[PDB]
Amino acid sequence: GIVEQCCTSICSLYQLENYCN
Amino acid sequence: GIVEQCCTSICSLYQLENYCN
Amino acid sequence: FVNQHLCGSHLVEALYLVCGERGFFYTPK
Amino acid sequence: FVNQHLCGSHLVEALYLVCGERGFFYTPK
Ligand code: NA
Ligand code: NA
């Protein structure tokens, strides 16, 4: 999930946008 | 939605919790 | 902190604090 | 602001800024 992608690893715009509605 | 309940009117715990997963 | 007008980042913050590990959805429009 | 480790309120903030009026879902667990 987002925590694995963005908190424990370096986030990206690409990944953040996966969690926009 | 949440903006109507919490931004343009006074928010509440009760309403916030409606938007928890 | 919840019993006030909360807009934008201020509203997102309150959701974050209240919902905890449950998480939340923020749908402004 | 997005290309870093972001946790907790810092992550929620980035979602808020990037997603805009679309909104977002934050599911930590
Ligand atoms: Na608290
Ligand atoms: Na921006």
Swiss-Prot record, chains A, B:
Organism: Homo sapiens (Human)
Disulfide bonds: C6-C11
Protein name (database record): Insulin A chain
Parent-record interval covered: 90 to 110 of 110
Lineage: Eukaryota, Metazoa, Chordata, Craniata, Vertebrata
Highest taxon, organism lineage: Eukaryota
